């Protein structure tokens, strides 16, 4: 019986790539979604008995847990197209610290360097849906995964601010945190191989 | 008159891409090499009067300085091919904390999250040459830029440990830190455009 944690920044297309592989080898595979803000916090509770976390969050090192890289994924800074930063201050880039950010909150109340808010005017939410709902309402700007802003950018509901900072979207590593135990069995290695190929072609 | 800082992790091929561009627009262009460990430390001294830093090091935000991404570059974990971690513990990956690291020292004595050593047994050096000299001598392992370990890996002098952690080498963003002043003049934007194209095709 195996527990796997995917944060809500991992496209749910990926979430199949593993699932088809892991059931070849394992009898029971439990998939658990979490805020990227909650991914590392969670696996650090032993009682949670997580054996794999796919998350964008980075941490020096965790107890009974090895890190590797599965691949890369995109994120944009988005705001309401009428937003002061659309074009008028767009070239400014570092203006973001002065406008209100819609940031993912953490249950733990504290954040990594990566996912810590950058503005002093912050409004915390649990998930990317809440974030973008508020961002469409012109309440603030936010950083969301590509799969969450695809539709809205085509619709013109949302506008990108990040293109000058990082053309093509903000490249973000996807880490695999894995219980040290798995490091030997060919099963885990099959999963990595597939998972890597299967997220390579999603670019 | 314009001062530009390239850390020693930026391939010196790149270091031309800019230089050909910047002299179209500027009359005097001063190129300054620094340890990636010293790049941000340096520009934070106003008396240094740096107007651009190309560095792999990341920092939340700097005074009178905006950040953007020029592109990506490779880094490998290397050790002497006889090294205990070649193959015998290679799959271990997190063993690195237990073997001696050859880390870039900083003049400032302190390091970013990114460039901070990961082993407790550290041996600091000024530059990647010293690092690899010691790594060939089997004294410890180290993380070096691709351009520095190309030859030695073909020669078999050095071996990669990083391939399971991150197939293809460790992707590392190259940031451009730029004095806020430049954000308006078309000159800087020409430089970014070129610099981005010119580092894209170096992959
Ligand atoms: C603050 C600024 C410049 C906009 C950046 N911040 C990050 C760090 N960061 C944060 N939140 C994210 C959420 C989802 C995803 Cl998919 C990625 C990120 C991310 O990289 C980078 S670039
Ligand atoms: C500790 C470990 C797992 C091996 C990693 N550390 C980094 C962070 N890091 C550090 N030193 C570097 C030097 C040159 C270059 Cl080109 C890149 C790096 C780098 O990414 C990543 S992966």
UniProtKB/TrEMBL annotation, chains A, B:
Q: Name one GO molecular function term.
A: DNA-binding transcription factor activity
**Signal sequence, renumbered to the chain:** none
Superkingdom of the source? Bacteria
Q: Which UniProt keywords apply?
A: DNA-binding, Transcription, Transcription regulation
Family assignment?
Answer: Belongs to the LysR transcriptional regulatory family.
Its name, as the record gives it, is Transcriptional regulator MvfR
Q: Which gene encodes it?
A: mvfR
